[PDB]
């Protein structure tokens, strides 16, 4: 798909077996999810932004659809005001941004 | 171009006919500039971000040169981490995220 920017970029994800809105974030070294159960390790990390830092847990090796396309790697989760999809998953799906 | 985005989305801007580095963010509904001075009045602002809200100075109507390309809008000056172009100057220069 070509997306235009008129509106905010969201899109259905896929997620530890849970439907969630997320923005499609280039701004976004890492994506980040807010408060729900995964599998496995994590480890807790300190993430900034516009208002400071918020503390998540690091889960490793997380398998997500994003608009139908899947893909692993890192998610961060914890009080994020919103879904975000950051680079390190929007590689994975081959996005890129075009002008 | 097309900008893929294993690396962060970084280009350069000019406005006020200075040169900054400033990220492509998909994530960001408005422009958020690091201090510096601009012409004319400002509005104010408050943007919420991954860590809470921050004040910002609201300038509209200002020249802004994004990786060679020409816009003119509105840019919000505050204590924002990295210069972002969000969608309102995006839209301006045709990009779109494709996959
Ligand atoms: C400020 C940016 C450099 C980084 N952010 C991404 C932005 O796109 C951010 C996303 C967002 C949207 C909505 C609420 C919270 C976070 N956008 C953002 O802060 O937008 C602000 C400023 C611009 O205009 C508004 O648009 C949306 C809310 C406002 S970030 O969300 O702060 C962020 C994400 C991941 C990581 B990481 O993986 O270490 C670190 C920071
Ligand atoms: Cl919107
Ligand atoms: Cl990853
Ligand atoms: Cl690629
Ligand atoms: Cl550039
Ligand atoms: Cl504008
Ligand atoms: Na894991």
Same mark, same amino acid.
């Given at each position: ?6 509106? @905010? ?7 530890? #077996?849970?439907?969630? =809105?997320?923005?499609?974030?280039? #701004? ?5 999810? =807010? ?5 496995? @390790? ?5 993430? #900034?932004?516009? #208002?400071?830092?918020?503390?998540? @847990? ?26 975000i999809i950051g680079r390190n998953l929007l590689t994975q799906i ?6």
């Open positions: 798909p070509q997306i235009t920017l008129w509106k @905010r970029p969201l899109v259905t994800i896929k997620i530890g #077996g849970q439907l969630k =809105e997320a923005l499609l974030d280039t #701004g976004a070294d890492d994506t980040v999810i =807010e408060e729900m159960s995964l599998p496995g @390790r994590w480890k807790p990390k300190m993430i #900034g932004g516009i #208002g400071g830092f918020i503390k998540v @847990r690091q889960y490793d090796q997380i398998i997500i659809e994003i608009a139908g396309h899947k893909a692993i790697g890192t998610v961060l989760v914890g009080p994020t005001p919103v879904n081959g996005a890129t941004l075009n002008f």
